[PDB]
Amino acid sequence: LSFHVIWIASFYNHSWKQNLVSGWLSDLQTHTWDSNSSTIVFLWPWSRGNFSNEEWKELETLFRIRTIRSFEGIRRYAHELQFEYPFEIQVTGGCELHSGSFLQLAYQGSDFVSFQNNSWLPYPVAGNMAKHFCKVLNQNQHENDITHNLLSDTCPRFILGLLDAGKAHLQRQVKPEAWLSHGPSPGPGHLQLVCHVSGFYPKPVWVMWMRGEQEQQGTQRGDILPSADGTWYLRATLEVAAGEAADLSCRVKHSSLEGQDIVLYWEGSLVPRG
Amino acid sequence: IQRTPKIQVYSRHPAENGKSNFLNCYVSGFHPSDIEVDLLKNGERIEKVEHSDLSFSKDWSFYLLYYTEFTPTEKDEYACRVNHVTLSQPKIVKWDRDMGSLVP
Ligand SMILES: CCCCCCCC/C=C\CCCCCCCCCCCCCC(=O)N[C@@H](COP(=O)([O-])OCC[N+](C)(C)C)[C@H](O)/C=C/CCCCCCCCCCCCC
């Protein structure tokens, strides 16, 4: 929900790093950072919001300065914090509105520290190094107040000119298509039937193998997977005894179909007929 | 702690010989973020494959989508080849498509 920013900082050795930053509206990517130019890149025309051209330049300079001090601070205190190269630091921070806000940092892919109200606190399991890291992070209270204001002030502001300006994207309806295939891993004397569902948006979707009106509770639904065009994909499989795949159908329900379910039948060359 | 990639291969549309389509390789759940992903046609690397910007899930494991526009024919097989620090050697996952009726 709403908006968050993610930061991927890879410290390969003391003299080599990589830095990736991107902004997300709900689950949609809306911005990227080009660290070559130190520029915020707008993936959609509406990802600017109503924010003035020059208000973005200030955010860019703040981002750019906070990044270079971040990489230098981490490398200065790496041995103090027992950070051994190579290591990765991930951050995600953002907000909601109506409401809520968050900012969390991981070291080597595990919870490390997070920002609560006005200061950084260590996750208890992260141990003494997380406490020592919070000493450096809480060095300057003014910098912390600025971090607070980005989460509780700037971030809801940003949705306020973004979710309205681009809900037309998040609320569009794109009908799925579906198709059937043979699954590659059946057990002996059995078949795996595969129902592919592709091209749908938004994400929520219903898919079941059926025998007429009877849902087949052996239907194993996969993860929903992304398509390059922003739509979603799902595979739903059913294991059946051979010959017992007669009268089976895959049924897809989706908001975009307005009750007109897609129904495909295990039939024709799939069976195969005579 | 290191986490090995999950690898899922899929097309955007049902396979129809001679119809352009998109081939996808979704790699997810891995850590650290360095990874090598190639799409293969008949065992050989496809040039100029696209991928999404690196991102990560709530549990901090990374994920990427690799894809390319392609046109299958009956004689072609496609796959996704992934290398990662967790892998002794690159893992190849085939695109599973049906050829249709086998025997005339
Ligand atoms: C990409 C598209 C973005 C679109 C955004 C539009 C809407 C934005 C809405 C919400 C955004 C929320 C973002 C929250 C960002 C969290 C910032 C926390 C980082 C604080 C860094 C300290 C500041 C500073 O500047 N830190 C430095 C200054 O400290 P100092 O003691 O020298 O004080 C200055 C005194 N002076 C004399 C006046 C100059 C100091 O070196 C810290 C080092 C900390 C070392 C650890 C690094 C921390 C890792 C976190 C990095 C996160 C980077 C975020 C980028 C995505």
Tell me what you see in this structure:
The complex is a heterodimer of chains A (274) and B (104). Chain A is α+β, with helices and mostly antiparallel strands. Chain A has two domains: 171 residues, no CATH class; 96 residues, no CATH class. Helices cover 23% and strands 40% of the residues of chain A. In chain A, strands 4-3-2-1-5-6-7-8 form an eight-stranded antiparallel β-sheet, covered by helices on one side. In chain A, strands 9, 10, 13, 14 and 15 form a five-stranded antiparallel β-sheet that branches. In chain B, the strands form two sheets. In chain B, strands 1, 2, 5, 6 and 7 form a five-stranded antiparallel β-sheet that branches. Chain B has a four-stranded antiparallel β-sheet with strand order 4-3-8-9, with no helix packed on it. Chains A and B meet through β1, β5, β9, β10 and β14 of A and β1, β2, β6 and β7 of B. Sphingomyelin binds next to β1, β2, β3, α1 and β5 of chain A. Chain B: Belongs to the beta-2-microglobulin family. Chain B: One of its GO terms (biological process) is cellular response to iron(III) ion. Chain B: This is Beta-2-microglobulin. Chain B: It comes from Homo sapiens.
